[PDB]
Amino acid sequence: MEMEKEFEQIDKSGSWAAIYQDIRHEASDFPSRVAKLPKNKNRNRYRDVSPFDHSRIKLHQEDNDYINASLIKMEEAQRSYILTQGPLPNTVGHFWEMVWEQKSRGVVMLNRVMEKGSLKCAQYWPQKEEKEMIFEDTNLKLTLISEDIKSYYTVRQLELENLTTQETREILHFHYTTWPDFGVPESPASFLNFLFKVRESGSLSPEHGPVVVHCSAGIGRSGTFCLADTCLLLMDKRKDPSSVDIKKVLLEMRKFRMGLIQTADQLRFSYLAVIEGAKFIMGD
């Protein structure tokens, strides 16, 4: 069923809450035993948001290999994403260790450091060229190379140096700065513009490690970003683009990380973004 018609049918009936609860009811449930070990309590921002054991990212160290991060592998679309929480004061070094070890080229940030008057994630990147950051626990150095501030997002070049080997790599940080404190954007135009800027950069492409995506918990806005990208790629690839079922793609992604898409308004926004983005993907 063409999703645009399914959309108007749910909207006229006002059943968004009922569709969303059906997804929550059918979603996968797998064990998260490593996340719940007592040694890991200060590595988790939220007690109710954990990575599944089968899909968690492992840090390459013998001490403690744990980070709140999951590998989402979309077999038919041929895309991989790492979804993670906003780093904590004691996990900023783990975060950049993961970026290094997984060979990522991009970090996608969908939140502000402060929202609703509270801290949603650590200030984990340098704000001035001449004041670099050193992470002594993981032996990494991070330098701001340049910034490009626009109305809806900012792009920057970070130089990450492995202090052990003196190798360096250029990481691109894509920061969406205008998602509202409450609800979802009224139009998906600026969110789709942002997604096409990440794509055009090569960060989502198979010659690199998976893109690292985060918000505060790494499930809501983060969920929206990877669902919209995967749905538009499947509409490009298949003979019948109207076969793409957004609810079935979301349940496949929820086999790899719990809770992706946190509200009925985020589900509706995801439909809107895919419907509007398809009017480029189908030749315009």
Ligand SMILES: O=C1N[C@@H](c2c(F)cccc2Cl)Nc2ccccc21
């Ligand atoms: O939009 C982009 N801007 C640049 C950029 C910066 F990130 C920071 C400062 C100046 C510039 Cl010029 N970097 C990019 C890399 C790949 C794709 C897109 C972009």
